[PDB]
Amino acid sequence: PETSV
Amino acid sequence: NPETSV
Amino acid sequence: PETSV
Amino acid sequence: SLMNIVLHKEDGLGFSIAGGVGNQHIINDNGIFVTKIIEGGAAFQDGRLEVGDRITKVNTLSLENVTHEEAVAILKETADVVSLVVVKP
Amino acid sequence: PLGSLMNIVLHKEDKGLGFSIAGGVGNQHIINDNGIFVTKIIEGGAAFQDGRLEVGDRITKVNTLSLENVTHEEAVAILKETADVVSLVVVKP
Amino acid sequence: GSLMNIVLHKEDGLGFSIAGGVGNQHIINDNGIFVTKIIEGGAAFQDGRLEVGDRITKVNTLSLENVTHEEAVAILKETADVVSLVVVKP
Numbered sequence: 001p002e003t004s005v
Numbered sequence: 006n007p008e009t010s011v
Numbered sequence: 012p013e014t015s016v
Numbered sequence: 017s018l019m020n021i022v023l024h025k026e027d028g029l030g031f032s033i034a035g036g037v038g039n040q041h042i043i044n045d046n047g048i049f050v051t052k053i054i055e056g057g058a059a060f061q062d063g064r065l066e067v068g069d070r071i072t073k074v075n076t077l078s079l080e081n082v083t084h085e086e087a088v089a090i091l092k093e094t095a096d097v098v099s100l101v102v103v104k105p
Numbered sequence: 106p107l108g109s110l111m112n113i114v115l116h117k118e119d120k121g122l123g124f125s126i127a128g129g130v131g132n133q134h135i136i137n138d139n140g141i142f143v144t145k146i147i148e149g150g151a152a153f154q155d156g157r158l159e160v161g162d163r164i165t166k167v168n169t170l171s172l173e174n175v176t177h178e179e180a181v182a183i184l185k186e187t188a189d190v191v192s193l194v195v196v197k198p
Numbered sequence: 199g200s201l202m203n204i205v206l207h208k209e210d211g212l213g214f215s216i217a218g219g220v221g222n223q224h225i226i227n228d229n230g231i232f233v234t235k236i237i238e239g240g241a242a243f244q245d246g247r248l249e250v251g252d253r254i255t256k257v258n259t260l261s262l263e264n265v266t267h268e269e270a271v272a273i274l275k276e277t278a279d280v281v282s283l284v285v286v287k288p
Contacts, residue, residue, distance in 0.1 A: 001039050001084050002051055004032045005091040006222045007107055007267055008234055010215045011274040012132050012177055013125045013144050016184040018229070020174045020264055022183065046201070075169040078261030081203055081284045097186065099170040101264045108268045138221040140266075165266055173220050173264045174229075196268050 017104045018072075021065055023058040025096045030057015031065060033091070036084030047072070048079040048087045050102075065102065073101035108196040110165075113157045117189045123150015124158060126184070129177030140165070141172045141180045143195075158195065166194035200287045201255070204248055206241045208279045213240020214248060216274070219267030230255075231262045231270045233285075248285065256284035 023029055032052035035041035041049045050059075050069045059065040071079050074090050075098065082090070091098075115122050125145035128134035134142050141164040143152075152158040164172050167183050168191065175183070184191070206212050215235035218224035224232045233242075233252040242248040254262050254270075258281065262270050274281075 001036075002032050002034050003084065003088045004052075004054075005029050005088060006217055006224055008215050008217050009107065009267070009271050010235075011212050011271060013127050014177065014181045015125045015145070015147075016122050016181060018174070018264055020171060022170060022175060022179050024186075072255065073261035073263045075171070076261065077259050078256035078263070078284065080201060080256045080261070095169065097168075097170055097183065101171075101261070107271070108266075110268055110272050135221070137223075140221060163266070165269060171264060173266070194269075196266055 019064065019102055019104065021062060021100050021102060023062050023098050023100070025098065026056070026058045026061070028057070029059055029091065029098060030054040031059045033071065033087060034084075036082055036087050039084045046081060048082070065100070066104070068105045070103040070105075071100055072103055075099050108163070108198050111157065111195050111197055113155060113193045113195060115151045115155055115158075115191045115193065117187070117191060118151050120147075120150065122152055122184065122191060123147040124152040126164065126180060127177075129180055130174055132177045139174050141175075158193070159197065161198055163196040164193055165196055168192050202247060202285050202287060204242075204245060204283045204285060206245055206281050206283065208277075208281070209241045211240075212242055212274065212281060213237045214242040216254065216270060217267075219265060219270050222267045229264060231265070248283070249287065251288045253286040254283055255286055258282055
């Protein structure tokens, strides 16, 4: 899981 | 340096 | 260095 | 080696994260880690944040021992200006 | 001895909050400490009328943002943006 | 480097003492908050997990990283009877 923020 | 009870 | 704010 | 980095948002913060409890990015470590820095985003213009940095604190909240979603929520529930405390590898 | 934390809420004026600061990473005001400290309070200014802020107080937090281990320029910027309302958490000696 | 989650139930406080913080470093070149004393019979003692030398990096949701000693004491004292700490063992 790679989440942009 | 200080020492504080919690 | 003293900056007014 | 902790650094306090203050970003002013440009529209989000302009980086991506990985890690968290149940979604380890590094074996035996639940920390939140920076994996990508967007050209032109806040973090990029500031110039200090780097891939691999561990985000341990966002404003007052700790990112230690949180889930990936919990870290995302903490980072997205911020004002236009944001204080991150990061640990350099 | 150990200081104490105080929350001080100021409403900005045309001339600002009415106090001056010193300190920050690379521009230490106190030995072995990058903290941000109040050095002057303008008579009649916002900080003066509120009456709580004092010279020597350490500004450790502005709204939610921490001012610990930031540059002097970053502290000035943080304090100069803000809305007309400003929340400080300070440490009194 | 090993982080541990410790949940304590207060007794008549938490039963340990701390040192450190920005401007009052307990270990040179480190602003961390460290446990320096554990009271026999106190909450931390009965739980058995907290140790002298532990770095407290989290109290409930709040981080103790990059705070003053006064703020760390306030964070630890403004807690309910139950408190969750995340600590780093040397």
